[PDB]
Amino acid sequence: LFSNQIIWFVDDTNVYRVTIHKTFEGNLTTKPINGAIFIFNPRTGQLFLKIIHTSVWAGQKRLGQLAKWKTAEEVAALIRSLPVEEQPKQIIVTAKGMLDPLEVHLLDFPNIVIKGSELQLPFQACLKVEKFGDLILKATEPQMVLFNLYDDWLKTISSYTAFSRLILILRALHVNNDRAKVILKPDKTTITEPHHIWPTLTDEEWIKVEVQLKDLILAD
């Protein structure tokens, strides 16, 4: 996972999003809201966030199915925009419905291996992190935004350790957002830098946090 080969995880979970409301007449209305594709490099921490504006669905039906195809289209478009040296060698998807769309969209890229995964990597949780949630909510058109999901961690820990830390954060936020946010703020003075995603914590603080997040996930 952290070798010389560029690897991307691709998450389509958040592409097609809706709000459901029961009207005064007793029927359900379903209205799309903006979504996002998450494309993540586990070695470097790079995230490509492709915001999906609701206008893309105009006209269309079976939007949850079409979202798999839209995701594959956008992955291919990103790849086309990158020099060959920056293109991934492997694309890993935790949703099985992404496999066939990606295969058909990436026929011009014979070097790229597509595989499925049973890992729990819930980028959905990022919608709970104000930076991402508000950006996605308020967008008025599609756009791509770059992030570094490991902040400054790699100065002192390995990619393996950083990946493990990130997964514990995402899973804990997914399972119990309120308690995870408390765990991640151990002191009144804990802050997150404006250009960071996650709090600035000491090594001792991260040790305790990681154990607490793991325990939270186990308690579900």
Would you tell me which residues interact with Cl ion (CB under 5 A)? Answer: 2, 50, 120, 142, 144, 158-160, 171, 174
Closer residue to Cl ion (CB): 2 or 103: 2
Closer residue to Cl ion (CB): 73 or 205: 73
Closer residue to Cl ion (CB): 133 or 160: 160
Q: Closest approach of Cβ 153 to Cl ion, in Å?
A: 12
Cβ–Cβ contacts within 10 Å for residue 108, how many? 9
Q: Dihedral angle at the C-alpha atoms of 89, 95, 101, 104, nearest 10 degrees? A: 30
Q: Closest approach of Cβ 184 to Cl ion, in Å?
A: 16
Q: Calculate the CA 93 to chain-centre distance.
A: 11
Q: Closest approach of Cβ 109 to Cl ion, in Å?
A: 19
β-strand pairing of 113-116 with 90-93 = parallel
Closer residue to Cl ion (CB): 111 or 158: 158
Closest-CA residue to 166 (of 148, 179, 189): 148
Q: Closest approach of Cβ 217 to Cl ion, in Å?
A: 6
Q: Closest approach of Cβ 139 to Cl ion, in Å?
A: 10
Closer residue to Cl ion (CB): 2 or 191: 2
